[PDB]
Ligand code: HEM
Ligand SMILES: [Ca+2]
Ligand SMILES: [Ca+2]
Ligand SMILES: [Zn+2]
Ligand SMILES: [Zn+2]
């Protein structure tokens with residue numbers, strides 16, 4: 001189909017998204033960059049969607065975190081989500097899209113700005129949310145592997161899918177874990193969707209980048225990077241370590257698995273058969289820049305190998 005402005009899409013119902021795309025690329029993502037607001041919007045997709053429990057309730061990827069912001073933005077795990085919720089709200093108000101659709105659309109558009117990134121499948125038509133998420137459904141960095149895997153499993157994700165989703169931490173920073181060093185990334189390339197996160201989390205810790213006693217934080221290998229306890233554990237625990245290492249220098253796998261698992265996440269609480277496929281509105285991401293490496297000065301002996309079956313691959317240092 002051909003939209004009013006000449007841009008094309010497989011389904012004409014998707015044409016409504018083109019002005020939304022343009023508006024967010026300029027006014028949410030600073031001119032289509034893979035920066036702060038992309039990182040925050042990607043986190044928001046998860047905090048919206050993971051509010052889904054057969055036992056406890058919540059409608060998943062339903063926009064509840066916006067619609068019921070007064071409740072959800074006060075949950076402790078939603079610390080520091082409230083800025084991006086406030087930023088997204090006016091776009092929802094001005095564009096006649098449900099909040100659930102908008103959150104997933106913005107997340108997919110944002111990821112597509114990141115070199116190495118993917119075009120996450122995007123479906124249009126989620127109804128407005130009808131309940132707030134319960135509290136305590138978002139994993140915390142001080143939660144154990146067993147707790148995290150049980151929570152994610154409750155929502156429908158296998159252990160390997162949790163690892164795949166954590167490729168998000170390749171384009172990510174922390175503002176609240178250590179509030180003395182806001183904006184500190186989880187890998188050395190927070191503007192590049194790459195395997196550096198899976199490499200750098202496997203390194204021996206060396207230092208605390210800010211203060212030395214924050215809940216849910218462990219030592220980082222690098223000044224200017226922060227390491228979550230949860231990521232530290234997931235990289236090393238026997239239940240997940242082999243899958244974690246399999247992501248290292250495996251860009252095609254990171255791409256394929258992140259896109260597919262994000263689509264699953266974006267559809268929690270929804271039925272794809274009642275939605276319209278608008279995947280081709282999402283921009284084409286740039287190719288990866290750079291290549292998997294150890295940080296400058298590091299060597300393979302700095303890697304804490306945790307997969308008994310398969311040795312860590314022989315990366316070189318910058
Ligand atoms: C599996 C358990 C997970 C835990 C324990 C966890 C924990 C965290 C924490 C503590 C932060 C930093 C918040 C702050 O202090 O500002 C963070 C940031 C982030 N998380 Fe995760 N996360 C998990 C899974 C995910 C998943 C599945 C996604 C997928 C979308 C995701 C995407 C992000 C992104 C993109 C950021 C960066 C936000 C920014 O730059 O402000 N996380 N996460
Ligand atoms: Ca929700
Ligand atoms: Ca990265
Ligand atoms: Zn900005
Ligand atoms: Zn911010």
Ligand SMILES: [Zn+2]
Nearest residue numbers: 145237238239
């Ligand atoms: Zn374990």
